[model samples]
Target: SLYKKAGMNTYGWDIVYGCSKRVVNKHLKEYITKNNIQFLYSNIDKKQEIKMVFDNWEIINGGSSNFLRIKTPIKEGYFKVRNTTVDLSGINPVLEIKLDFFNDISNPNIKELKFNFGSESNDDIKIIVSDLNGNLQEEDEFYFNKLLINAFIQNEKQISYIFASLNVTSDIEWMNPKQFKFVYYSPTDGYLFILSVVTNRDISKLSANVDGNILGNNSEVGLLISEKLFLQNMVLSRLSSNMGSNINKNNFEVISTSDTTGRIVNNSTLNWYGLKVAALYYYPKINNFSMQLFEGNKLKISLRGLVRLTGLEAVYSDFEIQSINKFVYNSTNKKAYFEVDKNPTSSYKYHLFPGDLISLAVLSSVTHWSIKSIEGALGFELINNFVDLINNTIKWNNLKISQVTNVTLNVGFCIQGNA
Candidate 1:
C-alpha cells in the first residue's frame, strides 16, 4: 500500500492482494521500521576490543558466584553493578563501586557494612555521607578494598587474593538488589596484600549457583566472570591456589602456611577453588541484539588441548608439578586439562593424584576427568590414597572429600602465553 501510496501502485496489489489493502500497509510499515533502527549497530573498532580481552577493568558482583546472591533460590536482580577507578596510576589505589538500584521501594538506602576481604573480622570502614535531612554521619576510621590483581611470574601461575572476597556488605526487605556505590580506599605497602576471607557454608548451594549451574556459566563479564583476562605476554616464563573434595552441601575452606597439616572446619564449604586463571574475551559485531543476551559479551574461551612441550621445562628438574588439587564438577562440562609431563614418562605425583575436592552441585552433576598419569598402572600411592594408579584413575577418596578450599598449594593458575 505504501508503494501504491508512493505512486508506484502495482496492478496486482491494487487488485485486492491478500484481499485487504490495509493489511499490506501494516506489514510494510513494520519492515521499514525494523530498518529504521539507527545506532543499534554501533561498534567500537575491532583491534580495540581484542585488546580488552587482554587487559581491562573487570566487574565483580558481591564476590563472584553467579551474578546471583544466594539468600534465596533466585538470581539477584535487585541491583546491577558498575565501577570507576580513582588515581589508579598514582599512589594509593581507590576503587569506586557503583551498585545500581533497580527498584526504589526495595533498595532505598545503605544499611550495615562489612568488608569481605580488606578488613579483619567485622572491622569498620569510615563513612561520611548525608541524608535528606540536615543529618550527617561520622566514623572513626576507614576500611577499603582495592582491585584484585595477582601477578604470574612464570618460572608462572595467579588470582587476585587481594580482592578475593571483595567488600561484601548487604540487606533484605531494605535491599533486594538496588542501586548504590560504596567507595573503598586502600594503599598497598608492597610484597603482600592485606585482605581477609570469611563466612563459609553451603556446598550444594554454591555449586548450584556457580558458573556451570546458574545459567550464567557461559563465561559472562564483570558481574559473572567465569574466567580471567590473560595477557599474551603476561607470563614471564613459569609460575599460581585453591584445590579441592568433600562438598558437604555447605562448603567453605580455610588453609594455613603449615602445608603438611592445616585446620579443617565442617562449616567450611566456600564457593571458591576456581581461583585458576582465565581470560576475558569480547564479541566483535554488535549488530545482533540477541547476542547481547549471551551474557557479558565478554567471554573467555575455555580451551582444550594437549601441549607436548620439549622435555626441558617439563623436566629440567624432571617430574613436573601438576595435580587435581581442586576439582569441581558442574552441569555443562568445559573441563580442565592437566598432565604431569608433556609425554607419558615414569610415575610422578599427578599420575594418580586423587582430586583434593569434588563439587556435585547441580542435579545429576557428573564428572569424568583424567589424572594424565602417562606412566600407567603403579604410580598412584606415592602422595595420597585418594587415587588409583593401578587403574590409571582417581579414587575420589572416602567421603569423596578433599581439604583445600581457597587453597592453591603452590601449583597455581592455568596461565597461557608465548614463552
Candidate 2:
C-alpha cells in the first residue's frame, strides 16, 4: 500500500497495520536478539546542546547606586551583573537574569543569557552596543525575526520595567549585531544601560497582515483615511434619507411636529405685528433655553456632530449650488426638493442628500442665519417674527398656486461633493 502509485490498495486490508506497544516490544526483542531495529528512534538526536552565552555587555550611562556603576568609555555608574538562563521548552521561550550594574561579564561561560530589569524602586538604565574594537556604539544587536519582537513599558507593584524580546530561530543572521537598546527611565537612580546578543535568526520571510495591527508601513495611514471616508459616506447617505424628518421636526429630534400653523399665521401682512411681538418673546426664550441646556450638559465638543454639520470639506471637493429656490416647508410633504446647476456625481455628494438633516435645517426650517443682517436693519424682534412665520406657515402646496413659481429664499451655498 505504501509503495503503490495507483489503486491496488482500494480497501483497508490492502494497507499495512501496526501491533500494540507490547506486541511491538516482543517482536523487537526477537529482532534485537538477531539484529538491531536501527529505524526505531533513528530521527531523534538527544545530544543537541542548546547553549547561550552573554560574553560581553556595557553600561552607557548614569545610576545613583554604587552597586549599579560602570567604569570605561564614558560610564560612571551602572548595575552589577548576575547569572541568567534561557528557557526553550515552550513555543515562545523566555530569558531571565539578574544585574547590579557594577560587574562586567561576571560569568562569560554561562550557558544561558537573561537579566533582571532592576530593583522595585525608581531606577533606570540605558544600554549601548560595542564595535569589534570594544568601543561603545549607539545600540546592541540581538538577532531574531524582526516581526517577532514584542516590546512594552509595564509597572509591577511599585516597580516600573521596560522590556523587549525577539522570537527564537534556528539561525542567527546578525551574530551579536547591535539592535536592542534600552534607556530605562527611573526617578531615583536615573537612566541605566545594557547590551546583549542572540545565536540563531534571519530576515528572510518578513511579512505583515494588513488587517492585523501586527506590522505595516506609513501607507497604512492612507489606508486608514480610506476607511474613514467610507464611514463618512455611509452617514452622509443616512442624512439624505432623513431629510424630510429633519425639516418638519428641526434638528435631529426624534419627535416630528409640524410648525405649519405658526408659519401660516406669520406669512400674512396683517400678522406682521403679531410676528414682531412673538419674536421679542421667542428670541429670549431660545437664548434662555440654550443656556439652560448648555449648563445641564457637559460642554465637550463632538467632532462627529461638527463634521455632520459641516460635511467633509477638507478631504472632499467643494462646489456651489447657485441660487437654489423652490424649497418649501410643509405639513404632509416635509422634504423640499431643489436641483443643483449640474447633476452631482455619486462620489462628489456627501451629507446633503435628498432628505439630508443639514439641508432640511438650512433650507427648510429656518431662513439662513444671514437674514440677521436684514433683521438688524428691521428690528431683531420684527425680523425674527417674519422669519418664523414664513418657515412655519408655508407648505409645498402654498408654493404651488397659480403658475407654481419658485421663490429664492437664499443665494449661493458653498457645498461639498462633485456636481
Candidate 3:
C-alpha cells in the first residue's frame, strides 16, 4: 500500500510509504521529500501498526481473504460529454439531437458533438450512429428520419441540456405508453435564432446532387427572395391579396380590384381585417439578417410613430391654406393635428401650421381573435380627414371623409425574443 499527501499550494503528489520495515528519526516534521519524512514519535502508539492509507486519486488492491486491505478515497470519475451521438431511431423516424447551434443573435454557429468509437484509436468526429433500436445500423441509410431533436434556440448565455423523459405509467399514448418529453432548460445569448433539426438523410440527399455550379440544388443558400424591397412587397402583396375572406388557396394569388374590396385565395382559415398603414413593408431577407433595417431606430414605428408630426413650409405661398380643422362624429371626437408655428432650413424639416396632409399610419388595439397554427394577428383600422368646427349659427349637415386609396397587410409573426 502507498499513501500520498497533496500539497496545498503546488499541485504535488508524493508517496509516503512502501512495503518495507523501517524506522524514522524523531524530533522533526517540516521537511520536503528530498529533506526528510522522519519525525519524532513522542505521541506515537507503540502497538499501532502502519496498515494502509489512501489519497484522492489512488488505486486499491485486495489480496486473498481481504487481508492487508489497501484503501482509497471515494471513487469518482472526471467525466465530460464531448461530441457524441446517441441512437434514438426506435423512438422517432427523424434523426435528432437537440443542441445549442446558435452562439447568439450576433454569432450563429452550430454545436459540435464529441465522442470515441470502434477499434480506431484515432478520435474523429462521430457523425452518424447506429439506429435507436440499438442494432449496428448505418446512420446514413435511415434518412436521419427516426430520431428527432427538439430544443429552444433563443435567449440568455449559458448552454443547457434538455433530456427527453416520458412517464408511461398510465394508458398507452403516442408511441406506445412510454415517451420522451423534450424539456428546454438553458440560457442562450441572442436576439433571434433557428431551432433547426438536420437529418443524415437530408444531408445525403443534399450531397448526392452535384450540378455544374449552375446545376446545384433548387433551393440552396442563394435561393429564396433575392431583393429586400421585393420581399417586403411580396409579403404586402400577399396580405392585400387576401384582403377579404374567400382567398383561393390553389392559385396563391389574392385579387383586390378596388380599395373597398379584395380577397385572398387559399389563406388558411383566419379572421383577418384591413391594414393600418397605407403600405406594409420589410427589409430584404439578407439585409435583415444584419438588422440594418433596425439600425439606429426601431424600423416598425420609429421614423413615424402611428401618430406623427408633419411639416409644411410657406403655408401661404403656392397653396390653398386652411385653418387647423378637426371634425368627429363620436361624442368624444378624438382628433388632433399639427399646427405650423415655425419653419426650418432643410426641406426634410419643413414647417407645419393650418392645413396639410399629415402622412401617418393610424393604429388601434384589437383582441379576442384566434388564428390557425401560427397565422398570428395584425393591425386594422379606418381613419378620416379632419373637418373644421362650424360657428354656433350653423348646424351640422353632412361630413366628408377621404377615399380609401390603397391597402397594407402585415404578414409576419410578432418577434418574441428567444426563450
- State TM-scores per candidate: 0.17, 0.16, 0.17
lDDT of 2 by residue, 1-419 (tens): 12221211111111011111222223223433343211101112322112111221232223332223221121121111122212211112122223322212554321221234453353332222222234222221231111112110121121211111122221322222222222222332122222222222331331211121100121101001111111122112232232222221122211111110000001111101111221221110010000000111111111110111223233212111112112222324333232221321111123345655645554221222222211221110101121221112111111211211111111110011000
Candidate 3 lDDT over 97-177, as tens digits, reads 222211224322222111111222321212223232343345433422221111101111112221111122213111121
**Model 1 Cα lDDT, one tens digit per residue, 1-419:** 11111211111110000001122223333433443311101113321110001111222123221121111011111111123111211112122222211222444432222122223232122111111122212321111111111101110111111111111232212112222122221111000011111223222222111111111112111111111111101110010111222222233222332211122222322221121112311111101000000111111111121211122112111122222212221214422222222333222122211342321211001111111321121111112211111111101110111221111011111111010
Which of candidates 2 and 3 is the stronger one according to lDDT? 2
Please give the distance, in angstroms, between residue 362's alpha carbon in candidate 3 and its true position after superposition: 29
lDDT of 3: 0.18
Please give the CA lDDT of all the candidate structures: 0.17, 0.20, 0.18
1 versus 3: better lDDT goes to:
3
Model 1 spans > 4 angstroms off: 1-196, 199-255, 258-333, 344-419
Worst 10 residues of 1 by lDDT: 285-294
